[PDB]
C-alpha cells in the first residue's frame, strides 16, 4: 500500500538520522548501528527496524541489547520531533541476510567450474 511504503521510508530516514547522533545515548552512538530497512505492520501495531549485525556474536548481542533498551526512548524522540503523530512501538530486528551473501562470496572465490472459467458453466447450462 502506498501510504505504508511512504511511512516506511519516512521512518527509515528518521531513524537513520537519529542513530547518526549521540542524541539517544552515547553508547548507542558509539555502537554505530546501521539499518537495512524499516517495515510497518499492516494494522500499524508495530514498526520493525531491521538492523545489520556484525560478524562478532558478542558485539551483536550487545548492540541488540542496547537497541532493545533504547527503543522506547527512540519512539519518544520520534514523537517529539513530530515526524509522525502516532508512532507504534519500535522493534529492532537483527538482519543476517548480508552474512549469507558474504559467505557465498567467500566460498565462490574457491568454487571450481475469469470469463473463460465461467464460460464453461454457461456452455454446460446451454447444452443441458
Amino acid at each position: 500500500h502506498a501510504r505504508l511504503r511512504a511511512l516506511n521510508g519516512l521512518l527509515y530516514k528518521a531513524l537513520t538520522d537519529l542513530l547518526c547522533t549521540p542524541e539517544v545515548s552515547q553508547e548507542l552512538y558509539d555502537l554505530n548501528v546501521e539499518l537495512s530497512k524499516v517495515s510497518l505492520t499492516p494494522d500499524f501495531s508495530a514498526c520493525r527496524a531491521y538492523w545489520k549485525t556484525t560478524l562478532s556474536a558478542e558485539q551483536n548481542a550487545h548492540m541488540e541489547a542496547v537497541l532493545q533498551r533504547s527503543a522506547a526512548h527512540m519512539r519518544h524522540l520520534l514523537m517529539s520531533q513530530q515526524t509522525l503523530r502516532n508512532v507504534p512501538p519500535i522493534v529492532f530486528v537483527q538482519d543476517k541476510g548480508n552474512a549469507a551473501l558474504a559467505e557465498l562470496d567467500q566460498l565462490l572465490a574457491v568454487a571450481d567450474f475469469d470469463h473463460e472459467a465461467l464460460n464453461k458453466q454457461i456452455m454446460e447450462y446451454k447444452r443441458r
Partner: protein, 300 residues
C-alpha cells in the same frame, strides 16, 4: 454524438488522411467526420449486424469514402488484414465504448430495463446465435460466480445479496425478461431502495442499473476485448496518428488510462493532459452521455 465537437477538433480531419472507427453504432461521429472532410478515407467497424447494415446503407451517401465492416475487436485485426492494410497507416482511430443509443432505445435488444424485453443484452444481433444471452448468464452462473461478476463489473458493494436473489428467482422460475430481472434485483432490497441510489448527477436511478451494466459487460466481454482493440489500434495506427477514446464507466476509463500510461518509455503523447468532459448543458441535453470521458493521444 457525445462531444462531437471535441472529437472533430482533436482528430482534425484532413484531405487524404486515413481514419478508423472501431465502433460504428449509430455512426453519428463517423457522419460528422465525413461531413467536415469530404476527401477523408474512413473505415467503420461494428459488432451489431444492424449497425453494419446501417453503415452499408449510409455508404450510398459516400460510396468509397466510408467502408463498413462487421466484427469484434478481436476480429478487427483479421478483418482489416483481409481488407489489405497490415501496417494500417491510419491517420486516426476513434474508439467509442458503452452501449449504442439505437441498441439501448430498442426494447427488443434487451439493453433497457425501463422497457420490457428478452434478457438478451447482447451487442451481437444474430451474427453468433450460439453466443450466450444475459438470461443464460444469470440462469447458469452460480452464487459465487455471479457475485464476483457483479462486484468486478458493476462495482456493486452488495453483490452477494443481488446474486442470491437472482439465484432464488431463477430457481423458482426462469428469468427471461428485463423487467423480471429488474423486479428481482429490487426485491433483494427494501422497496424504498428502488430509486435510493443516485448517480453522479444526483438524480434517482434504478438499483438494477449496476446489475445490468455488469451483465452486459460479462456477456460482451467488454474489458478484455477493449484491451485487445486498443492493442490492435496501436499496432495499426500510423506513427503520429491520433487516437480518441470515449468512455462511459470507471473500468474502461481505468483500462484506457493504464494502457496509455503503460502502468518502459511511453508509447503515447497525451494531446490533452486532463480528461475532457462534455459541457454541463450538453450533459443535461444528453444524460446518457454524462459519464462520457474523452482521452486523446498521439502514437509514439
Amino acid at each position: 454524438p457525445v462531444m462531437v465537437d471535441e472529437v472533430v477538433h482533436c482528430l482534425s480531419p484532413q484531405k487524404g488522411q486515413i481514419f478508423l472507427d472501431m465502433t460504428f453504432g449509430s455512426g453519428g461521429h463517423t457522419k460528422a467526420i465525413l461531413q467536415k472532410e469530404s476527401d477523408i478515407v474512413l473505415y467503420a467497424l461494428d459488432r451489431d449486424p444492424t449497425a453494419y447494415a446501417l453503415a452499408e446503407h449510409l455508404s450510398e451517401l459516400y460510396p468509397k469514402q466510408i467502408r463498413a465492416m462487421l466484427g469484434q475487436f478481436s476480429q478487427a485485426e483479421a478483418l482489416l488484414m483481409k481488407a489489405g492494410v497490415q501496417p494500417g497507416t491510419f491517420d486516426g482511430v476513434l474508439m467509442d465504448l458503452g452501449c449504442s443509443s439505437m441498441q439501448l432505445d430498442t426494447p427488443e435488444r434487451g439493453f433497457s430495463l425501463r422497457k420490457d424485453g428478452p434478457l438478451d443484452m447482447r451487442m451481437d444481433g444474430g451474427r453468433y446465435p450460439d453466443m450466450p444471452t444475459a438470461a443464460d448468464v444469470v440462469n447458469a452462473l452460480d452464487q459465487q460466480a455471479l457475485a464476483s461478476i457483479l462486484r468486478t463489473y458493476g462495482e456493486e458493494k452488495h453483490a452477494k445479496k443481488i446474486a442470491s436473489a437472482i439465484v432464488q428467482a431463477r430457481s423458482i422460475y426462469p428469468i427471461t425478461r428485463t423487467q423480471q430481472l429488474a423486479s428481482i434485483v429490487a426485491g433483494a432490497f427494501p422497496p424504498s431502495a428502488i430509486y435510493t441510489r443516485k448517480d453522479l448527477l444526483q438524480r434517482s436511478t434504478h438499483i438494477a442499473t449496476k446489475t445490468f451494466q455488469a451483465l452486459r459487460i460479462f456477456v460482451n466481454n467488454e474489458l478484455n476485448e477493449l484491451y485487445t482493440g486498443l492493442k490492435t489500434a496501436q499496432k495499426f495506427l500510423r506513427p503520429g496518428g491520433r487516437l480518441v477514446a470515449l468512455s462511459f464507466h470507471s473500468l474502461e476509463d481505468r483500462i484506457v488510462k493504464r494502457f496509455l500510461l503503460g502502468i518502459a518509455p511511453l508509447m503515447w503523447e497525451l494531446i490533452h493532459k486532463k480528461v475532457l468532459s462534455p459541457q454541463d448543458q450538453d450533459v443535461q441535453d444528453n444524460p446518457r452521455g454524462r459519464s462520457a470521458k474523452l482521452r486523446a493521444a498521439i502514437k509514439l
